[PDB]
Symmetry: D2
Subunit: 488 residues, 4 copies
């Protein structure tokens, strides 16, 4: 066990005044990775006053000065990629083959992107008449709060903190209690790059206490939350009741992958695998409802089974391992309950469905890669996000039907279609009710591409130019050079 992990406030680690702690577990062994201090209500207020002071220094700097500091943070992240990836693997259970190639790399890509856009953040000017004009400023919100999830801890912290800092704000970040460690490292890296004290503070803790203290604080102007649909509704509600904060929410999904009647089934099966079993199924954007034409279903199932057999579970630091345990043991239990629900409702188990057993698996929160077929739109596993390695295969007959069924859900995060046909690809995608759409691929989320959910899957967007703007507030200023007329 590491030394007791402290809070990060105003450029330094600092002891919590709450008197409370929590533990993070290595999901591959069950051992305690570390004891972590939990931020109390007084700790949150202290972090906010620190952030207010830092934000004023940060915002008073020039745009290019802020860009240079974020770019130095990028360089440090690239250099420390493997060290951070290893820590992320210990905390999350994700294979090093993933964490060393994706988590920090794509997190730093977004920070690098926004570092370069700071000088392009511009207001507007509007002429009204010769004697009057309007101009606008895109001003910082002030102090914002980001609340992270556990599947991509450092990536999420970068995707929230990068636009927030680039827009001139200070952010107080609360990582998930499951995976608090990499965010504390990120805080040191930012300071090492020259970020002014207070601009990025990290408050580990529990959602019911630390997260709620942030959502309630009167001087925080915005909350950005990544997490579950149910917890999101609570965060957004508490954020409104306290001080009417601006809100961004990235929640889960039940995204459909539509295989067209002209699709090559090797390509479709490869896309379905990457849409379901990367990060052991713990990805909000996963294509967990795979729609396949009835005439192809039997062949597609065989192609899925062959590729499931190639999945290589084992030591998370081994080069060939491409599948890990789930993030925690309680989470494994929920995934298993969904699997039992699939059996009890009559879905046909094609493969998996149980924990992994044997030396190297008995002490980890492993679930076998699991595929259900003969699925129907009313089944619990088809309707609800599992956030585990569980693919649901559904047969369909015609294009209009599959679009209706793909859209008949409260979720709206992602979608995809597999087809070589120009007209079919655009025609279908334009009709799907989702914010993130992939044609003949899955999963790639470039820094330039806004991503977020329709309907219950989210509020607002992340990434792209628009997210830099959404971390500012517009001030309109009218200059009246004419004589003002009063009717009184």
């Amino acid at each position: 066990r590491m030394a007791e992990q402290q809070l990060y406030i105003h450029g330094k680690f600092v002891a919590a005044t709450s008197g409370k702690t929590f533990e993070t577990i290595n999901p591959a062994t069950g051992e305690v990775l570390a004891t972590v201090q939990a931020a109390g209500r007084e700790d949150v207020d202290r972090a906010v006053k620190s952030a207010q002071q830092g934000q004023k220094v940060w915002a008073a700097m020039s745009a290019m000065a802020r860009s240079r500091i974020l770019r130095k943070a990028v360089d440090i992240l690239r250099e420390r990629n493997d060290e951070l990836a290893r820590l992320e693997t210990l905390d999350t259970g994700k294979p090093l083959s993933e964490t060393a190639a994706v988590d920090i790399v794509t997190g730093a890509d977004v920070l690098e992107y926004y570092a370069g856009l700071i000088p392009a953040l511009e207001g507007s000017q509007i002429p009204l008449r010769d004697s009057s004009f309007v101009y606008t400023r895109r001003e910082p919100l002030g102090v914002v709060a980001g609340i992270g999830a556990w599947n991509y801890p450092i990536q999420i912290a970068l995707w929230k903190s990068a636009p927030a800092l680039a827009a001139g704000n200070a952010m107080i970040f609360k990582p998930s209690e499951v995976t608090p460690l990499t965010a504390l490292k990120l805080a040191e890296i930012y300071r090492e790059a020259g970020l002014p004290d207070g601009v990025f503070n990290v408050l580990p803790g529990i959602g019911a206490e630390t997260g709620q203290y942030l959502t309630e604080h009167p001087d925080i102007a915005k909350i950005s939350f990544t997490g579950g649909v149910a917890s999101g509704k609570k965060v957004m509600a508490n954020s409104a009741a306290s001080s009417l904060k601006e809100v961004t929410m990235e929640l889960g999904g039940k995204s459909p992958l539509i295989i067209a009647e002209d699709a090559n089934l090797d390509l479709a099966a490869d896309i379905a695998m990457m849409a379901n079993f990367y990060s052991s199924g713990q990805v909000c954007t996963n294509g967990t409802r795979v729609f396949v034409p009835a005439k192809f279903k039997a062949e597609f199932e065989h192609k899925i089974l062959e590729r499931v057999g190639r999945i290589r579970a084992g030591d998370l630091f081994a080069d060939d391992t491409n599948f890990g345990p789930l993030v925690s043991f309680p989470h494994r239990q929920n995934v298993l309950r969904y699997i039992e629900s699939g059996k009890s409702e009559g879905a046909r188990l094609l493969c998996g469905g149980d924990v992994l057993k044997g030396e190297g698996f008995d002490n980890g929160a492993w679930v076998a890669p699991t595929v259900f077929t003969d699925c129907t739109d009313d089944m619990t596993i088809v309707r609800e996000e599992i956030f585990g390695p569980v693919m649901s295969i559904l047969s369909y007959d015609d294009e209009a039907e599959v679009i209706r069924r793909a859209n008949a859900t409260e979720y709206g995060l992602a979608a995809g279609v597999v087809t070589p046909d120009l007209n079919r690809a655009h025609r279908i995608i334009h009709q799907l009710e989702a914010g993130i759409c992939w044609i003949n691929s899955w999963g790639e989320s470039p820094a330039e591409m806004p991503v977020g959910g329709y309907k219950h899957s989210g509020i607002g967007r992340e990434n792209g130019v628009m997210t830099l703007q959404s971390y500012t507030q517009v001030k309109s200023i009218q200059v009246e050079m004419g004589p003002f007329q009063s009717i009184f």
Copy 2:
């Protein structure tokens, strides 16, 4: 009186199935203007199903076809300006001198503005590599809901419905129970202009029921609310708990008006008058904290007294009337309680402070134009929105001090400065924490200018190009033309 007012669903007036009605009162005479049907839970569901069907027709039209229909609505509104203004006066008690020059004129201006921008609504295209690119669509939200306030009934209905419809949505509008009449007229006008049935439905009712049914409905994608700060928090919370709706909120303020030491005091007094006594003080953006340099306070007070003496209360249809009663007797009661708190807390009454009495006033909720001076930052009348004709005059000594005090509030809607000095005007305005800032003027809200609140005064914005975009949602589409690679 008038005929019983029904609901407007799918291009026709229709009876409510709630079995409930309410009365709208003429605030100048006390007479029942009309009996109005109240939309029940089932009526809201009918309106949503109507809106869904109409929205599909609307969105499938070409952009210019939508533009032309809204422009026909503009032309009808210009032709009926005076008739609609007189109706607005009957329902609100605001003088015809105001309604015939502002309410419909500026409401129709915003509709004309967005009508012309529909064809300019564009997504983006982002090249990733030779073998892949991303493009974005700005898609309609679907069915959205507007909830109006009673001070500017038809203007609010136009400022919400114009961008929502121009963005390809259908809107269900709930007017305030105080002032439902003009919204029903607007619904007929839209139909007459060629708006497809269902695209604009109007559901009169009470906030506790009809408003709550809209915030709760699972198939409404966005709520846009104008009203008080307190009611706003309830709407925003209920929108999250039910279906995680996008939300826009335009709430009240306690906006500061800063008179600089080099200001001409006749101009300052004229601006203060217009910032406090228009629409009898029932304006969210009013400059109700008037900061005057200590050395000019006495002279400024004299100039206010002289201009207050010229305010002309009387017949609301006479050209020289420039002051009306408050919208209801309960609202006047609240304004009178604030005036009494001002007296009891030691503020000096400069003028007014009582109800108006005599023939032509006894049946209306009239309050005299009221000015308090010798005010301090801790007084109730200085800290809280009154929404009545009550100006608070505060003295200050230096620029840094006045900026602090101007910003030391939870409200953030508007602000202004009076100064002929180039540096002082821009320098002060840039430090003020408000979304709407006026230099040497007050009140003008051009269609091009985004307007909305900082902090507790609002979420999001109205008007400007950005509000058109905010009634769309982004879908990002990646076209991957290279061979997809699975790691499994």
Copy 3:
């Protein structure tokens, strides 16, 4: 008809040149009208009129300008058929085209820009707490447009709409071949409430009236539509005189690529519309049709079947879809190109000569003409003909067709016909042209910027960007801090 005058400051006025020219009806050979030609003094009058009007125009509110342009739109829709008939007499294009395309799409662009006027915005850039920058998009002032003869009224609208919408006054010179509809537009604009001087029309000869505009010191921009060679001279003269901003929409030799998986009925329909509309007198025409060798014979048969359905005749008849060429001198140039095709070894698939008989002997008719077995070195393949002459070329592989499609000084338009998702985007992204069509040809939405690569143009028309290109940026720095001198 009545002797046609110049239009300056809201009225018809006699030219001071003492010179006139005649415009010929291309279907009968008869003189339609005698038109006065603007001299150097007339241009100076138009410019001073424009300077006075532009100030009135620019001082109005943005929405005031929008309403006036929208009222011109309403007048244009109501007089569509009348304007179309005049266009047919002057151009020779069938009424089936002029009543459905010329005024409709010209008015579409005017309607489009009318609505964007209030969205024209500058920027604001903070530098530090004590200094910021804001920009204005200011009118250029007086700008000049020089039209072509194939789409007289449409081109006048596509140039004047963004110019006026941006707050400028425009002096428009129509082609001497086709001056009549531009003068009608001038009246319509005035009837809509456009202030006097904001749109002046100066008919005349390119060698005189055009050159006087390109040389005038108080004109800030020249916008020219025409041939590549004429464009180079206009742009040079605009530079040598007063360093004007320039926009040029010139000709092309645009390629139409038929893919190996293309449906040949669709390909043939696209090739027909890309070659024989307006009798082949369209700058964006796909006059190089690349077809896979394995499909060439079938494609040739399908083209011939559709050429036989072409209906030449009375231009005011509903079923007529093919007209004479705009002038007899132009037909002479088109016939010389056809003879080179014959002499250089291209195989004549149909047409190749003038049309004869009652109703055709007195008009400047050329039959729909198709060459095949063409090679990249032939004159008919390398140079814009601007007549109804399709060249069919065979190809074997994708890389080859892209190299050959791009192997030209022209850069205006291009297209591909394919149902395959990857092939359509992949090929289009590599073609060196500004206007690219997938599984279609010819559509030019008001929202879509259009213009040429390489020798086919400078700048763009239509879309939001063209509104901005008719403004000039002024950057303004507000320095609220103390200024420090090193002296």
Copy 4:
């Protein structure tokens, strides 16, 4: 002495095949700094084929890959700032107090700015109907040519190459024959940073041969030229006559500085000094027509003379030197002809008017700081750009008059106003016909700010986001998914 300077083509120095050379002179001593090879027609053809090959490599990289390479060039330029400034001082005669603080600093600022914007370069997407949409690409022009001037050699090379390279083009740069040395250093710096071979080639030579050969070449897509008005017309003409190239031109001016009646005259005099005598008056944007109110003329003249007396000419590497010789002896002769016309036409000489003589000046191209007053709008020195240290003071009586006179010129590059009054500052500036306007300052040209001329002072702009886009060409693409209809 330095080594014979060669051409830079495809990542290496290479001998010209023209057989021709020229010499660059140290303007402070008259000595030969270096012999420089002159590129002939064949060398130009080779550089274009090099550029075509390099441009393909550069454009096929990712946007962030291009961004990183330019950022490494920024880092090298910052580290080598003093060495580069010293070389520029030797080649131009500008004091090191200027070159080490401005030339490379602001040149590198612009490269840094555009490096970060590469990922934000985006096309558009326009929906037409359900069955068809349009998207646009911002494609590189290909090979572009920059032709520099001699007053700010390395800065001009950076301001032209930075947006051109950031947009994916290759640039062939021709420096002025007066000042070729720093451009060749920049080429090595770009290669050291990782710029692919051929993307930045430098061809020293004469305008009549090397300049003309580039403007004529069929495979160069755009010309960007900085220089005199007369040469500009010739460049723009040859660019059109050959292959109809896109053009950008930054030419000279006769920019007005308007001192208002309420201006502080010390501030006005400091601004006029910086607007006339920086770089010895060899700045295109200089405020050489100084309009002063008649009532303040005498006092303003006194304050100018006092500040002129502080000008410190001397050793160009000494810290306190703030005034240098002119760039060449032929240019001094032209400046002297203008000064003589000022005397002969009746303008009153307040100071200067002759060369500087004595030890340390006799071998340099020195002209004394010169001020004329009692100037009138018809004088040659008032109407024509001198590009030397010659200020013209003009008296005026009222605002309308000074605006007319300020605008009564074929030039349009810059302008400025000195006034503390809010209304006067914006009101006057909005009426001036110039692309670059300064209020209460002069000379600052932020990377974010587009700069360029009205009328004869230029075509197009430099700096700002718009200049990155102007180095691309728009391709519009319509996808028609519905059945195509032929009328034949």
